[PDB]
Design a protein around this ligand. Sequence first.
Ligand SMILES: [K+]
Ligand SMILES: [K+]
Ligand SMILES: [K+]
Ligand SMILES: [K+]
Ligand SMILES: [K+]
Lengths: 660, 660
Amino acid sequence: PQNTFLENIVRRSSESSFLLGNAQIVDWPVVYSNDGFCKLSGYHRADVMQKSSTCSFMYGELTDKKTIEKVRQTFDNYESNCFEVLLYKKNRTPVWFYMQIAPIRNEHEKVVLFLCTFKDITLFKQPIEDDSTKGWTKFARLTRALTNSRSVLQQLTPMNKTEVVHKHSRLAEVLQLGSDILPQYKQEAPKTPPHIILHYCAFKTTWDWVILILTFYTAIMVPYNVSFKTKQNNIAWLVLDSVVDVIFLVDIVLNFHTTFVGPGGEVISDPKLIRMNYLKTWFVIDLLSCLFSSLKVVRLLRLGRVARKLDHYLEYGAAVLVLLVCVFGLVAHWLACIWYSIGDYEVIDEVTNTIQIDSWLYQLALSIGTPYRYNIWEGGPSKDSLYVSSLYFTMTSLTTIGFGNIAPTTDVEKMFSVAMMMVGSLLYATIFGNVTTIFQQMYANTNRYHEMLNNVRDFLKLYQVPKGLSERVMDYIVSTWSMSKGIDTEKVLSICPKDMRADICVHLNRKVFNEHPAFRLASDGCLRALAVEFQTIHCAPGDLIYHAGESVDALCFVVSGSLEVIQDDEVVAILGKGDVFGDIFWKETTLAHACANVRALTYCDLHIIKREALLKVLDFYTAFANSFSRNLTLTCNLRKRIIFRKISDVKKEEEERLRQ
Amino acid sequence: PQNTFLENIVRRSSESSFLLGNAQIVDWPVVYSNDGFCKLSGYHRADVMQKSSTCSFMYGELTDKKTIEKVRQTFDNYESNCFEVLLYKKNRTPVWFYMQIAPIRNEHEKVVLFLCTFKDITLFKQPIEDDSTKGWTKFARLTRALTNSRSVLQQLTPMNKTEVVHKHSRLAEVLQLGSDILPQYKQEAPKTPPHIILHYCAFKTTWDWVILILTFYTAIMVPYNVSFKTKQNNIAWLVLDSVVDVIFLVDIVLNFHTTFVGPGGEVISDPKLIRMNYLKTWFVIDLLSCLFSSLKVVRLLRLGRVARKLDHYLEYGAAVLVLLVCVFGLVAHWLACIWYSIGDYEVIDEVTNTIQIDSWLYQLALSIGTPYRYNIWEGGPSKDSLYVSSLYFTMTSLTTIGFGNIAPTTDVEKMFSVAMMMVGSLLYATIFGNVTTIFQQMYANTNRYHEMLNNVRDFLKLYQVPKGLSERVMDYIVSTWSMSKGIDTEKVLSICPKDMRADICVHLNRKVFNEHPAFRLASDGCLRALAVEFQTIHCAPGDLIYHAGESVDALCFVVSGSLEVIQDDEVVAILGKGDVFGDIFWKETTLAHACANVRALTYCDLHIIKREALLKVLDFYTAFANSFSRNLTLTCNLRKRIIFRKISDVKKEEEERLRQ
Ligand SMILES: [K+]
Ligand SMILES: [K+]
Ligand SMILES: [K+]
Ligand SMILES: [K+]
Ligand SMILES: [K+]
């Protein structure tokens, strides 16, 4: 979903000098300048920007005031016209210009920009200049000013009294561009020329699936008709072939309207190139396949379409397995057809008029019960029995089972079965390799988890870590792999450079920004920085976050669970569900000693930010630092001690005081 | 094993304002405050904490002194009562409050906290105020003070003379909460509602195994009865089916009392949701299976339970192999049943009254010796021979052996055996893939070791490292892989963020803390820092730790073996089993030159700490730095030289002195 607007303007331009300027802002500042206006006026594309689009920076002394009034009025209310003005270049050279103001609409019909096309008509008019010494100086400059608009555009009548003709041509140009000057500045979808269908359309995929099914049907049925002679010839079967043939012809015609995917880029929608691409790639095979025994067997070339279209599916693992099973079936069928052809050729020698005992057809006739008769020769098995027998034999010989009811006994059958085995071994090996790769795909991840589990267990066993601490480590490993399922956040967030990382981190830390009053006067950039700098931790019951002597260097926000801050074996604070603790880092500049132990009661969830990152962020943004200081109050400051004296000690010391 | 105490209090609360305060500490400081007390008094949950739970910070001028005496007495000795007091909000607004003090017991019946529930009865009493100008000001505030306790709690009789009714309701509320106010603050185990059994209980796993065995039995026996017609019908077999059916009905009833595991969380024990979950997931299959040929064959739907329950076992590698072997056996049995059904249907055409020679049953009858008789038709093989023959054939066709005694010869048998082969190829490929994955699991680790071994050997051979140094490198590689078995401590310790790392490191370095007088006045935090900062090394006989010019930058503790410090080819120190050497880093601030070579005599073990980490730790903790300086004496200081003059030189120079 691009926003191709400059590309359309320059494609339509044919070497123009458009001067896109903003509309909603006062004075209509210039936003963009083509590198054709840098030569028509001498102003580079670094000072023309942010200047008024009324060309107030090129208005001089003898400029027409009334044209200034007209252009001011045209800019005032949104309308398009055409004017001829007399401006000055960077060298204070008087030059006549043609201006073609036109507004450009937004997505929902709003004026956003004002496109100002400029043309040069210096040689086409009389630019009277005062600082001249000879008459010829009034002529040569005309050739100097106009070079790409005289010998290129209007050179058929470059002689006098043609100025009115030039004005008429300019008027015709400006009148017949009603919709060409408004390309609808908007983020639109890709567009295609008429009578062109997208290769990824909803209709095209269904057409491709239909073509695949029909190609499979042809591959199944053509060898059967070639080998078993069919010879039924109904009217309910000769029309299906014709329907399939006309469908394939329709597909050949329709493939000329397909958007070829570019070499690493995106779709290409130029009919002058798609035709040539198809002709050079795959117009010979398609024509040959869709054109006697040879004419009817050449139709197996339709598998080229299946080979071409199966590229995205071949990436997967199960799709290759299904494809291999299908080709296994088709190969078995084709070998069955060849085997029956051999068996039919071998029986009944024609030089003599006897029947061969060697052929598998005669042995099959003995084993079924229907023998041959007559001596022309008639009898034998039915037409279904022959095909079922052939398929059964070629399936015994491809799966490496080989029962032995139907087996080669003639010289030709043996040297054909040798090739059958040579092909079948490779096919079977391919299937086995695909299956084992498919299994390894998932057992790789499972073994990756179990290897870490076993390594941790063996490390704990080796260094004789006492029971009660090994159990906690094992439970933590199991629990974290159950919760996260092996998905590491850092590896995923390393990808997607820092435009989606900030948004993802803001979403992850939404519970400490939405439900906390401190992060309420923060700009988007500051929130992005804080979100990418927090990181979060998960606790377990009994785990300690800070001990009695650790250095507090992180502000911790509690979003789930409950914490217990205990000092001198006495509970002094209970936290949970929206409490912040730690130390006041931004105004102390000294790491302190955690005065109390912070234990976890239930399964907690903390969003802790390190000291250095927080200080860096608060130093970069000044106003937010003041807001953060004013609006944040820690519910448990782990720097100062709470002074108290226990009741049991009071009662114990009272007795001693009474004694003395 | 959570400590859900606040959750129980807030669940029982029904929008109360409990004010949990400590008990063992004098004045009973407030520990936790609900975010319902921040509006009943205006005190935020940042200044109410660490204040006396006697509400001394809200006691005003006209507060009842006698109620103060009662609450002081109630806090003095551990007892629970209820009082009505007249307190002040943050805006000095007189407000009547109901206080419901109650102690909370520890695990072993000890008073720990004092829960003080508060209620507002402002509109329910007459709060006389002095700073008033009109009578109506005495009424509107009543609507302002009470909003969530008048229109929500008591709105059925909001008229005069109902104050006594309100007092009676309050007394009834306080009297009938004897056990609800004491949730036994304690780290307890998960609890379940009555008549609910844990899904991981010791009984549930046995029940699941029994159900698995019975499902396997049904899958084995139902097709046999369907296909071979059985027709024995004893009284010792019709009751086993009934017993299994009632057992499965009992299981269907009992599965309504199972704790479903939450989506990523832990068990869910709400009967109103487990029932709906079971009904939506798996109540149709279970009902259909446990309900003619169809009614007796639908029982194979019981395999859904096996499919569901086998999720944790499917992770392993050998369990999948056992499952695949079992399904191989069951598939062979089912194909045997189908094969016998086909063979029985084919023999003896019923249109005529003859016997078919094609069927495998007739060929089997010929090969055994028992033929068919009569022409109704009687004879043939026994009932055991038919089943053994069918199983043998379908096992020859699944293992890709295919002897050929029993093989398809009829049209139906061939087109059934084709499907048999199509299934068997995939099954056999699956088994092979599983086996090779299982082998690769362990050969991956073995090859990982051998690849490093070969790389080291080839690197030593390539750069022609002289013999006597390559041998030492190879011996070190072999010895360290024998001792550690490929278990890297750093990779294991990277996991388990810094709460178990400190404990593990303290345990690993226990031999330098317990058996050394220097680490005897160290707090837990300092020991944790030192333990996580040491790292340890293993030596070999002949290896040198420090040379004659290296920079000493580590304090080394010897815990096993013996060291030899030699200077000028003379032994000047022997160390071992509790000796510390190195340099005095904390008061020199200059890296020195090791004055002597420290060789290893036996297989040593050192716990060496780098200079930077030790200095950082000793700079963070001040008192421990003084204790460490006072209590540590190095047995071999590798900064100062020992001045000595050898005896052999004395004797040699004596002769020269006598000569001159
Ligand atoms: K075989
Ligand atoms: K294999
Ligand atoms: K094989
Ligand atoms: K065989
Ligand atoms: K045989």
